[PDB]
RNA sequence: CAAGUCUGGGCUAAGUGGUAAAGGAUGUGGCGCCGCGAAGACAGCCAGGAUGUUGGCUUAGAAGCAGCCAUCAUUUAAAGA
């Protein structure tokens with residue numbers, strides 16, 4: 001039982017759980033047809049905005065560590081993510097949607113503090129609730 | 144996929160292997176022996192890559208993003224007309240002055256941009272050619 | 286690890302009888318007896334049929350996998366048991382059907398007339414290719430063997446009767 | 457061919473027995489050690505294995521696969537010019 005240094009500095013480096021607060025965290029695999037998405041091997045000199053390895057290593061037992069509340073997007077645990085630039089700019093910089101560029105990227109599970117589901121359709125399709133919040137300055141009660 | 148070249152220094156040569164073999168390749172070759180001929184014109188021979196693409200039909204694609212790995216080598220760097228028995232003799236020795244930022248041209252695409260990257264990439268067929276050249280006198284850890 | 290001997294096979298439109306040293310399959314495409322060892326209980330269960338062995342020693346284990354694969358194979362037997370391509374590469378070479386019988390020409394002073402044994406059926410759609418309809422598995426793989434053996438498939442030249450792959454070609 | 461198809465335990469599938477060695481062997485049975493494994497090993501199979509590239513040296517060209525050789529260096533789940 002080495003528990004090889006492949007798990008040791010790649011078991012999170014306890015990072016992104018405490019880095020770019022370790023929640024909102026969500027969907028979408030360790031890899032499928034390698035042509036398209038991208039800033040794959042291009043996030044300026046690192047892959048600080050992607051991940052490297054190991055579904056069995058960390059996710060099975062890593063632990064509860066470092067949070068924000070519950071859950072649930074679409075589904076549950078098999079393969080996940082890493083970034084600081086979540087739901088709004090999570091999708092003007094990566095992972096467009098439905099199906100995608102390449103052939104239709106697939107699946108994962110989330111947990112932030114905004115109460116609800118899917119994480120694909122309404123939250124993650126270049127939704128400019130930044131440029132449609134100068135719409136609220138007179139809405140819902142005013143004369 | 145769809146890849147080959149056109150070269151060497153200037154006055155492009157569509158020879159029996161370098162451009163008359165454009166049949167079931169792209170075939171609009173009267174005006175595009177001239178729209179590449181300013182994209183390898185007035186640069187100088189050391190390698191000068193050629194990027195060529197695929198289509199549904201017949202013409203009009205891109206050229207190149209960088210000529211590295213022996214080019215910014217044998218202009219003035221490393222004095223590397225790196226003679227036969229590729230050289231454990233110092234066929235020519237430098238530092239990272241005509242290697243590191245002679246080409247920040249490298250930065251378009253080798254997937255790592257910050258310069259211990261495609262700098263030391265092109266010090267592959269330059270630096271480790273027998274005389275692994277030097278980047279410093281070895282930083283002095285402390 | 287992960288032995289071919291003790292998984293559990295399959296249902297749905299096929300029979301099973303267990304004599305003490307033979308199992309009779311008898312599904313929709315015909316029937317297949319399976320000569321089988323008289324050690325090795327072959328116990329039949331719901332829509333599956335496992336085989337277990339009386340000891341766990343080197344000589345009983347080899348007999349275990351064999352008798353599983355032997356039954357399973359007779360069950361895909363009685364549902365689509367045929368196979369075997371025989372693409373006929375090379376220039377003068379053409380196969381054709383006459384009667385129930387295959388007559389192929391691979392460059393001798395004569396055509397070679399194969400006839401099909403029972404439970405075997407010849408197909409030559411597109412006559413540089415000839416498929417073998419079979420129920421069994423091993424009689425099928427045989428008649429395809431024999432057909433292939435008639436002509437080469439060299440080894441210096443892409444002529445002969447070919448299964449699949451293999452550009453071998455020495456020069 | 458006189459007296460056990462005697463009694464318990466295990467071995468061998470060669471008619472060895474009923475023989476001849478160096479040497480060999482996933483025959484087979486038994487005692488050991490050591491390596492890797494349910495933070496998931498060994499088979500398979502599913503996916504990806506590059507760029508600048510043609511590495512330089514030789515060169516109608518070798519662009520891993522005609523070669524004599526510096527065989528780099530980043531990058532990166534991971535990929536030997």
Ligand SMILES: [Mg+2]
Pocket residue numbers: none
């Ligand atoms: Mg007597």
Ligand SMILES: [Mg+2]
Pocket residue numbers: none
């Ligand atoms: Mg006795």
Ligand SMILES: [Mg+2]
Pocket residue numbers: 471474
């Ligand atoms: Mg004897």
Ligand SMILES: [Mg+2]
Pocket residue numbers: 474
């Ligand atoms: Mg003898």
Ligand SMILES: [Mg+2]
Pocket residue numbers: none
């Ligand atoms: Mg011996």
Ligand SMILES: [Mg+2]
Pocket residue numbers: none
């Ligand atoms: Mg043994």
